[PDB]
Each structure stands twice: as C-alpha cells, then as structure tokens.
Design a binder for this molecule. Structure first.
Ligand SMILES: CC(C)CCC[C@@H](C)[C@H]1CC[C@H]2[C@@H]3CC=C4C[C@@H](O)CC[C@]4(C)[C@H]3CC[C@]12C
Ligand SMILES: CC(C)CCC[C@@H](C)[C@H]1CC[C@H]2[C@@H]3CC=C4C[C@@H](O)CC[C@]4(C)[C@H]3CC[C@]12C
Ligand SMILES: CC(C)CCC[C@@H](C)[C@H]1CC[C@H]2[C@@H]3CC=C4C[C@@H](O)CC[C@]4(C)[C@H]3CC[C@]12C
Ligand SMILES: CCCCCCCC/C=C\CCCCCCCC(=O)OC[C@@H](O)CO
Ligand SMILES: CCCCCCCC/C=C\CCCCCCCC(=O)OC[C@H](O)CO
Ligand SMILES: CCCCCCCC/C=C\CCCCCCCC(=O)OC[C@H](O)CO
Ligand SMILES: CCCCCCCC/C=C\CCCCCCCC(=O)OC[C@H](O)CO
Ligand SMILES: CCCCCCCC/C=C\CCCCCCCC(=O)OC[C@H](O)CO
Ligand SMILES: CCCCCCCC/C=C\CCCCCCCC(=O)OC[C@H](O)CO
Ligand SMILES: CCCCCCCC/C=C\CCCCCCCC(=O)OC[C@H](O)CO
Ligand SMILES: CCCCCCCC/C=C\CCCCCCCC(=O)OC[C@H](O)CO
Ligand SMILES: Nc1nc(NCCc2ccc(O)cc2)nc2nc(-c3ccco3)nn12
Ligand SMILES: CCCCCCCC/C=C\CCCCCCCC(=O)O
Ligand SMILES: CCCCCCCC/C=C\CCCCCCCC(=O)O
Ligand SMILES: CCCCCCCC/C=C\CCCCCCCC(=O)O
Ligand SMILES: CCCCCCCC/C=C\CCCCCCCC(=O)O
Ligand SMILES: CCCCCCCC/C=C\CCCCCCCC(=O)O
Ligand code: NA
Length: 394
C-alpha cells in the first residue's frame, strides 16, 4: 500500500512512446535510403531492410502491445498470448536477418568469384519470406498449446473481476518459463548468436590469411630478385627464377581489367630469363631479369595495393556489421538472464518490477540504434541520409 501505481506507469509509458517514435523515424530513413540509392541496392542490404522492417514494427505494434499488457487487463487467454508473444516473432526475424548477413559476407570473402552467381536477389527474397514464416511459427508456438491457459491464477482473475474464459493478461502468468528459457533463449537465440560469432571469426581469419599470402608472394618476388643480382652460377639464377615464377601466377589468382597485361609482361620476362639461364648465359639472364623491377613497379605493385585495400574494406565493413550483432546481444541478454534466475532459482526472490521494466525498455531501444551504426560506420548510408535530410526537409 505505497506509491500509486499510475506514477511509475506514467514514466514507463512515456519512455516506451519516446522509443517508438525514434525506432520508426530512424528505420524509415534506412528503407528510404535503400529505395533511393542504387549503390545500396544489393543482397546484403535487403536483409538490412528486412531488419529495419522488424524494428519499425516494434514501434508500431510491439510497444503498444507492451504498454497494453502491463495493465494486466482482462482478456481471453489466446488473445493475451498473441499480445504477449508477437514481439518474439519480430525478435526471431531479427536473428534470421543478422545470421543471413553474416553468411552473406562469409560467402563474399571465401569465394568472391562465385558470389554473384550463387547469391542473387531472387534467392535472397525467397530466403527472407521463408524466415518471416518461420519467425511466426517459432514466436507464436505458445498459442499452439504450450501455455498456462489451462492453469489460471484464480486469485488474480477474481481480484481484477475478469469474466468467464478470461485471464488477467500478465506475461509470466500465461507464457511458461520453460518455453522462454529452453526453447526461445537456448535454442532460438543463444545458438544462432554463437553461430554468428563463429562465422565472423572465420571472416576475419580468411581476410588475415589472404593478406598474409599476398605479402608472402610479394616478398618472394623481391627476395628471389635480390638473389639474382648476387648469384654467380647459372642454376642458382634459374632456381630463383622458377620460385619467382610460381609466386607470379600465384598472386595472379587474387573482360574489363587491364591487369592481365601487367602479369603477362612479368611471366613472359621470367621465361625469357629462364631460357637464357638454361643455356648458361648467366650475365644475359641477370640483365634480362633486371627489367622485372620496372614491370613490378609499374603493374605488380599497383595491383597488390588495390587487392589489399579491397580486403581492408571488407574487414572494416564486417566489423561494422558485427557491432550490430553485439548491440543486439547487449540489449536482449538481461531479459533472458533474468528469466533464467526466475526459472532456475526458486529459492531466489523475483527480480523487482522496476528492473523487469528497465530490461523491457532496454530490449526495445535496440530498435533505435542500428540507423546510427549505419550513419557512423558506412559512408554510402551517411551520404544518402544527408541528401534525404537536406532535400526532403530543408
Ligand atoms: C494494425 C493491424 C495489424 C491490426 C492489429 C491487430 C490487433 C490490434 C488485434 C488483433 C487480435 C486482437 C486481440 C484478439 C483477442 C483479444 C481477446 C479479448 O478478450 C481482448 C482483446 C484481444 C486481446 C484483441 C486485442 C487486439 C488484437 C491484438
Ligand atoms: C548483459 C550484461 C548487461 C549483464 C546483465 C547483468 C544483469 C542482467 C544481472 C546482473 C546481476 C543480476 C541480479 C543479481 C541478483 C538477483 C537477485 C535474485 O533474487 C533475482 C535475480 C537478480 C535480480 C539478478 C537479475 C539479473 C542481474 C541484474
Ligand atoms: C554469454 C552467454 C553464455 C550467457 C549465458 C549465461 C547464463 C546461461 C548463466 C550466467 C549466470 C547464470 C546463473 C547464475 C546463478 C544462478 C543461481 C542458481 O541458483 C540457478 C542458476 C543461475 C540462475 C544461473 C543460470 C545460468 C546463468 C544465467
Ligand atoms: C494497432 C495499434 C494499437 C493496438 C492497441 C492494442 C489494443 C489493446 C486492447 C485493448 C483492450 O483489450 O480493451 C478492452 C478491455 O476493457 C478488456 O477488459
Ligand atoms: C530510461 C530510464 C528508465 C526507464 C524507466 C523504466 C522503469 C520505470 C519503472 C516502471 C514501473 O515500475 O512500472 C510499474 C508497473 O507499470 C505497474 O504500475
Ligand atoms: C510494419 C511495418 C512494415 C514496414 C515494411 C517496409 C518495407 C520497405 C521495403 C523497402 O524499402 O524496399 C526497398 C527495395 O529494396 C528497393 O527496390
Ligand atoms: C508487420 C510484421 C510483418 C512485416 C513483414 C515485412 C516483410 C519484410 C520486408 O519488408 O522485406 C522487404 C525486402 O527485404 C525488400 O527486398
Ligand atoms: C496508439 C496506442 C498507444 C498505446 C495504447 C495503450 C492501450 O491501448 O492500453 C489499453 C489498456 O490496456 C486498456 O485497459
Ligand atoms: C510452418 C509453419 C506452419 C504453421 C502451421 C499452423 C498450424 C495451425 C495453428 C492453429 O490452428 O492454432 C489454433 C489454436 O491452437 C487454437 O487453440
Ligand atoms: C552455455 C551457457 C550456459 C549453459 C549452462 C546453463 C545451465 C544452468 C543450470 C542451472 C541449474 O541446473 O540449476 C539447478 C537447480 O537445482 C534447479 O532448481
Ligand atoms: C552475466 C552474469 C550474471 C550473473 C552475475 C552473478 C550472479 C550472482 C548469483 C546471484 O545472483 O545470487 C542471488 C542470491 O542467491 C540472492 O537470491
Ligand atoms: N519475464 C518477462 N516478463 C514480462 N513482463 C512481465 C513483468 C512482470 C513480472 C512479474 C510480475 O508480477 C508482474 C510483471 N515481459 C517479458 N518479456 C520477456 C522476454 C522477451 C524476450 C525474452 O524475454 N520476458 N518477460
Ligand atoms: C525520464 C525518466 C525519469 C526518471 C525519474 C524518476 C524515475 C523513478 C521512478 C521509478 C519508480 C519505480 C516504481 C516501482 O518500483 O514499481
Ligand atoms: C531517430 C533518428 C532519425 C531522425 C531523422 C528524421 C528522419 C525523417 C524521416 O524520414 O522520417
Ligand atoms: C497514442 C498516444 C499515447 C496515449 C497514452 C496511452 C495511455 C496508456 C493507458 O491507457 O493506460
Ligand atoms: C556479452 C555480449 C557483449 C556485448 C558486446 C558490446 C560491444 C559493442 O558495443 O560493440
Ligand atoms: C530508472 C531507475 C529506477 C530506479 C528505481 C529503483 C528504486 C525503486 C523504489 C523503491 O525502493 O521502491
Ligand atoms: Na530488431
């Protein structure tokens, strides 16, 4: 018999509405930017748009649902369940989109030549539709019978004065905690998050290995070259030539590219120097191999810098997207962890109400943050945001 509940409720409702406004506005901007700019119309950003659509729905539907269910109003139990569980559909859809983005970037760095033929917009669209259907089936599974509708709180249902077939609509009274912990958290949230962690680990390892190979081929080119100018035997020169030749066509594997001309001059100049070396013409081999360094300084170095900056851009982009996964875990793990304490420690007092609603608010603010990550970390998004804001506002 303490403070009137409407005072704490007013703070919670006001905060939730403030979050809904920001989740809608920022994510509308993301969709608008992708619609407007053809540089943003790729497969990766179709999952970004699906993720933005889920976050718009958090503000338009899930947050009004959250406000409604906090009152504990009388409702038919299956109507209560849909109000209580709809946010899990949107959260599961976010998981699928984040997982698809990770696999997309993994395919792009592991087999870039085959990427465009394997990962197409038509297949992406079908993957998205399937993930939304599965998200409804996973998120609304309690409506299929795994619920507490058969064991109502009669004390609460008579206090509130509910009618026949009605319950006081409270989350922890209608949704069983073993579904929430075992099915939703462990299987549907925690396992995909660990998979995303593993995929991103593989992305960074593949990039580090591909940059290391590039550097080893480059040093192999210049080491064997320095050995050429120092040798005094015909076969000693031919040995540094054959090892320079393998590294040559090795780096070649890493019609609108004038780069094959650079590698054909290089490999042809090596073979010329090889034929001299086999004929004992040492000094001719050493002089014919000395013109390699201008072919290197006019073609090979230009292509090994361009391949390096492309890999660095893929690493920077993959880090930007991994931040999105980290902030998702940050905002949703407290609620899951609180549920674990409620479920696994019956000797523990229940987490207090103010902490419950702080964790609910925290999970909702995740629907606000992604547009900020795009604006700060991805230039093409930031510049498109700027144009939209300047033009279609001021
Ligand atoms: C905006 C578009 C998607 C329509 C939104 C549908 C929402 C508002 C509708 C669809 C199903 C509806 C629920 C279905 C049944 C019940 C049980 C009843 O005892 C109280 C109302 C309640 C809880 C309804 C509340 C409103 C509801 C959730
Ligand atoms: C993911 C990051 C933010 C870590 C989150 C840590 C939070 C969720 C943890 C840290 C300390 C935890 C609390 C410590 C002890 C209790 C008392 C118990 O009777 C109910 C659970 C409760 C209230 C825990 C709830 C969850 C809790 C608040
Ligand atoms: C980063 C990933 C692994 C997060 C998962 C950590 C979870 C599963 C761990 C972290 C802290 C753990 C809790 C810490 C203490 C207790 C009290 C005990 O009487 C029941 C189990 C319970 C409630 C644990 C359940 C499992 C738990 C919630
Ligand atoms: C769509 C936009 C908003 C959705 C609002 C959610 C609608 C919330 C349902 C309101 C309700 O059930 O009231 C009847 C009570 O008197 C029962 O006791
Ligand atoms: C943003 C910082 C805090 C948000 C505050 C969120 C939690 C504030 C307390 C909410 C609360 O206690 O809710 C009572 C419940 O609605 C029954 O009246
Ligand atoms: C509930 C809200 C759903 C809102 C869904 C909004 C869907 C917008 C999709 C979109 O913007 O698509 C751009 C497209 O890729 C360009 O060809
Ligand atoms: C409201 C919940 C259902 C929202 C359903 C929205 C479908 C997802 C979507 O809009 O996808 C667009 C696609 O990514 C464009 O290429
Ligand atoms: C626009 C929706 C703003 C939030 C609506 C909250 C609401 O409708 O609450 C009804 C309450 O449960 C009745 O007992
Ligand atoms: C893929 C998923 C298909 C989902 C199949 C959905 C099966 C029907 C669900 C249903 O009919 O639920 C009624 C509810 O249990 C009334 O008490
Ligand atoms: C992977 C991360 C966590 C897995 C380990 C989480 C397992 C937590 C088990 C807690 C437990 O078993 O609690 C026993 C208690 O006696 C029941 O009331
Ligand atoms: C993340 C880790 C959260 C776990 C943080 C450490 C949790 C300490 C264990 C605990 O919460 O003990 C409660 C005590 O029994 C009173 O009921
Ligand atoms: N445990 C829980 N409770 C609520 N709302 C009810 C908070 C509450 C708890 C006890 C009480 O007596 C009155 C109200 N929403 C909740 N959402 C979630 C959730 C969604 C996704 C993961 O956890 N868990 N969750
Ligand atoms: C903007 C947020 C303003 C914060 C100012 C006061 C918040 C404190 C009110 C929280 C009351 C908790 C009620 C409860 O325990 O159920
Ligand atoms: C929240 C951050 C986004 C605010 C910018 C307003 C965008 C206007 C709009 O397109 O709806
Ligand atoms: C729409 C604007 C928000 C209206 C305020 C909702 C009040 C919540 C309630 O009725 O308990
Ligand atoms: C436990 C999960 C750790 C959360 C990662 C947050 C780091 C970040 O904000 O990028
Ligand atoms: C936001 C901040 C929430 C702080 C509320 C914690 C104090 C609860 C008041 C009380 O002791 O009953
Ligand atoms: Na989301």
């Amino acid at each position: 018999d303490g403070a009137p509940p409407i005072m704490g409720s007013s703070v919670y409702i006001t905060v939730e509405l403030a979050i809904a406004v920001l989740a809608i506005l920022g994510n509308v901007l993301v969709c608008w930017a992708v619609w407007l700019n053809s540089n943003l119309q790729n497969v990766t950003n179709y999952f970004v748009v699906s993720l933005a659509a889920a976050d718009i729905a958090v503000g338009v539907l899930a947050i009004p649902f959250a406000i409604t269910i906090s009152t504990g109003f009388c409702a038919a139990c299956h109507g209560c369940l849909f109000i209580a569980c709809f946010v899990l559909v949107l959260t599961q859809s976010s998981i699928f989109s984040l997982l698809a983005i990770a696999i997309d970037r993994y395919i792009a760095i592991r087999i870039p030549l085959r990427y465009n033929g394997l990962v197409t917009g038509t297949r992406a669209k079908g993957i998205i539709a399937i993930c939304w259907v599965l998200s409804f089936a996973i998120g609304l599974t309690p409506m299929l019978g795994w619920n507490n509708c058969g064991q109502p709180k009669e004390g609460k249902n008579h206090s509130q004065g509910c009618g026949e077939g009605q319950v006081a609509c409270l989350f922890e009274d209608v949704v069983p905690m073993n579904y929430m912990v075992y099915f939703n958290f462990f299987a549907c949230v925690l396992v995909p998050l660990l998979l995303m962690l593993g995929v991103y680990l593989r992305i960074f390892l593949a990039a580090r290995r591909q940059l290391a190979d590039l550097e080893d081929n480059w040093e192999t080119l210049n080491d064997n070259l320095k050995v050429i100018e120092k040798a005094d035997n015909a076969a000693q020169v031919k040995d540094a030539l054959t090892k320079m030749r393998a590294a040559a066509l090795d780096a070649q594997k890493a019609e609108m590219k004038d780069f094959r001309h650079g590698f054909d001059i290089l490999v042809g100049q090596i073979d010329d120097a090889l034929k001299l070396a086999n004929e004992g013409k040492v000094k001719e081999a050493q002089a014919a191999a000395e013109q390699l360094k201008t072919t290197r300084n006019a073609y090979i170095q230009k292509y090994l810098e361009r391949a390096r900056s492309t890999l660095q851009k893929e690493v920077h982009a993959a880090k930007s997207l991994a931040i999105i996964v980290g902030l998702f875990a940050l905002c949703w793990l407290p609620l899951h962890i609180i549920n674990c304490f409620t479920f696994f420690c019956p000797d523990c007092s229940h987490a207090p109400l103010w902490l419950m609603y702080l964790a609910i608010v925290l999970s909702h603010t995740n629907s606000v943050v992604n547009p900020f990550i795009y604006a700060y970390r991805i230039r093409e998004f930031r510049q498109t945001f700027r144009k939209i804001i300047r033009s279609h506002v001021l």
